[PDB]
Design a protein around this motif. Structure first.
Motif, mmCIF file in Angstrom:
data_model
loop_
_atom_site.group_PDB
_atom_site.id
_atom_site.type_symbol
_atom_site.label_atom_id
_atom_site.label_comp_id
_atom_site.label_asym_id
_atom_site.label_seq_id
_atom_site.Cartn_x
_atom_site.Cartn_y
_atom_site.Cartn_z
ATOM 1 N N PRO A 171 0.654 -1.290 -0.094
ATOM 2 C CA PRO A 171 0.138 -0.092 -0.139
ATOM 3 C C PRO A 171 0.921 1.092 -0.044
ATOM 4 C CG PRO A 171 -0.931 -1.494 1.567
ATOM 5 C CD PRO A 171 0.323 -1.906 1.173
ATOM 6 N N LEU A 190 1.128 2.452 -3.601
ATOM 7 C CA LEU A 190 0.138 2.605 -4.452
ATOM 8 C C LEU A 190 0.087 3.708 -5.338
ATOM 9 C CD1 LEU A 190 -2.542 1.347 -5.190
ATOM 10 C CD2 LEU A 190 -3.890 2.634 -3.211
ATOM 11 N N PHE A 231 -8.135 -3.631 -0.526
ATOM 12 C CA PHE A 231 -7.376 -3.416 0.505
ATOM 13 C C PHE A 231 -7.291 -4.685 1.255
ATOM 14 C CE2 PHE A 231 -7.580 1.055 -0.731
ATOM 15 C CZ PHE A 231 -6.246 1.366 -0.774
ATOM 16 N N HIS A 245 -6.391 -5.926 5.199
ATOM 17 C CA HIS A 245 -5.897 -5.783 6.359
ATOM 18 C C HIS A 245 -5.888 -7.031 7.400
ATOM 19 C CE1 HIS A 245 -6.781 -1.205 5.769
ATOM 20 N NE2 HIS A 245 -7.715 -1.878 4.972
ATOM 21 N N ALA A 296 -3.539 -1.432 6.215
ATOM 22 C CA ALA A 296 -3.387 -2.184 5.142
ATOM 23 C C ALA A 296 -1.793 -2.539 5.024
ATOM 24 C CB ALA A 296 -4.116 -1.658 3.789
ATOM 25 N N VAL A 319 -12.478 4.742 -10.340
ATOM 26 C CA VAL A 319 -12.106 3.426 -9.445
ATOM 27 C C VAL A 319 -13.345 3.322 -8.778
ATOM 28 C CG1 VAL A 319 -10.495 2.682 -7.707
ATOM 29 C CG2 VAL A 319 -9.693 4.284 -9.397
ATOM 30 N N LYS A 320 -13.224 1.955 -8.446
ATOM 31 C CA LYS A 320 -14.027 1.482 -7.361
ATOM 32 C C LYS A 320 -13.274 0.758 -6.639
ATOM 33 C CE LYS A 320 -18.182 0.116 -10.545
ATOM 34 N NZ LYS A 320 -18.821 -1.055 -10.034
ATOM 35 N N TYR A 321 -13.573 1.093 -5.088
ATOM 36 C CA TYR A 321 -12.761 0.373 -3.974
ATOM 37 C C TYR A 321 -13.532 -0.528 -3.453
ATOM 38 C CZ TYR A 321 -9.957 4.507 -4.772
ATOM 39 O OH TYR A 321 -9.252 5.594 -5.414
ATOM 40 N N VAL A 322 -13.270 -1.668 -3.853
ATOM 41 C CA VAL A 322 -13.671 -2.952 -3.571
ATOM 42 C C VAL A 322 -13.819 -3.128 -1.955
ATOM 43 C CG1 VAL A 322 -13.326 -5.482 -3.639
ATOM 44 C CG2 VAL A 322 -13.829 -4.315 -5.664
ATOM 45 N N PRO A 323 -14.868 -3.865 -1.435
ATOM 46 C CA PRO A 323 -14.764 -4.422 0.164
ATOM 47 C C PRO A 323 -13.737 -4.960 0.269
ATOM 48 C CG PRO A 323 -16.505 -5.349 -1.213
ATOM 49 C CD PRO A 323 -16.053 -4.459 -1.942
ATOM 50 N N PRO A 324 -12.830 -4.340 1.597
ATOM 51 C CA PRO A 324 -11.579 -4.849 2.063
ATOM 52 C C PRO A 324 -11.606 -6.188 2.440
ATOM 53 C CG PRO A 324 -12.756 -3.439 3.679
ATOM 54 C CD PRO A 324 -13.599 -3.458 2.585
#
Lengths: 222, 222
Positions: free
Chosen positions: A151, A154, A173, A175, A182, A197-202
């Protein structure tokens, strides 16, 4: 019928009902590789998939259960490539997975530019620009590159991606626990894609007890 | 002794033991505000905090209970500022929190550039660059800017922060449930800071059943 050498054992890819030759000294697949395989969106049918840093062929083995697409796994070290080739053969996936012992920086010697659907990389510096450069060059317009990285890198990475025409579209991300920062991030870049961007579920790897999370348990055991 | 007016109602900030004047019709604070407050690291003692889009004074009220620092709440919409001012008076915080009604694009008419410790903003196009420039211009070296925004904007936001000498150092994603993509991100920028981001543990708001997570309950209930 199978020929194991020295330190080697035949492990299980449990969710996929496959076996993989592995070594506690030489090479063992990490969580990162399984997570990257799962992160990757495969073509609806068919397609060309290249794993850039194949190692013992963990990712080709994992992706193979999911698609009929042809898979190339590129690995520069003879010892790792030979494990991969043997694991592929044990599983009788020779007609789908092709392990090549070659330097990725030179894979253009063997594989045409810009004809691949999906490039995958789980690195084990400046060498990171190379793998991104090469991934990009292998992909046709609309092709995906999926990376695992740290990360802290990134943003430096997103700058590199674009330099080569990959646009980030999905980020995930990882964790260790629900209250730690992360340490791993997954990235998909579309070759010549439109921004967004779509930040996908961590992913949370472990509960406090330190046992695997349910999400992890379904991924490792099915 | 206090006069509510119209629709207005006097709400509880439970963790902070305070009251806030509010209207279902005109303005109610969101979880975003509460999370931004919580997100923000405040100076060890003293210091100057500016809340750039203050609304009904929610963030200044929240930050006040945690620090002895002085707080300026900027809100140009006449009715919202009034609610804040009256909420500050009810809570007897006038000696700590100043509400001010001025265009933020021109706020340096009233507040000197580059003297604040902490700038805070939870917006209610170009107007985003405006607020990030202004926030940057109010912070001294090593001062922190705290923003709430949409994840789709994040990468463009970073370009912007850097254009005005705000380096991102902390990023927190908010996901409605653990199986859904992020709809809010919290960002920290240090003025003239050195590069390096920590991706803070994300916040999961609601559980599988429909109600608040334990993490959120503590932020809302103490």
């Amino acid at each position: 019928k199978l020929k194991l050498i020295g330190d080697e054992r035949l492990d299980y890819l449990l969710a996929e009902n496959l076996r993989i030759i592995q070594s506690p000294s030489v090479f063992s697949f990490s969580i990162d590789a399984v997570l990257l395989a799962k992160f990757s969106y495969l073509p609806i049918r068919k397609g060309k998939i290249i794993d850039l840093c194949s190692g013992n062929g963990i990712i080709p083995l994992l992706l193979s259960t999911r698609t009929k697409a042809k898979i190339v796994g590129v690995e520069i070290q003879e010892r790792l490539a030979d494990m991969a080739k043997r694991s592929v053969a044990y599983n009788q996936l020779e007609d789908q997975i092709e392990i090549i012992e070659y330097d990725l920086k030179k894979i253009t010697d063997l594989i045409p530019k810009e004809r691949a659907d999906i490039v995958t990389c789980n690195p084990p510096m400046c060498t990171l620009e190379d793998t991104i450069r090469v991934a990009a060059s292998l992909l046709k317009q609309g092709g995906k590159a999926n990376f695992v990285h740290r990360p802290e890198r990134l943003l430096d990475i997103i700058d590199i991606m674009r330099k080569y025409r990959l646009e980030p579209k999905r980020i995930q991300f990882v964790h260790p626990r629900s209250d730690r920062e992360a340490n791993t991030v997954l990235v998909e870049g579309i070759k010549d894609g439109k921004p967004g961007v779509k930040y996908v579920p961590p992913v949370i790897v472990y509960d406090e007890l330190g046992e695997y999370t349910p999400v992890i348990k379904e991924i490792l055991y099915g």
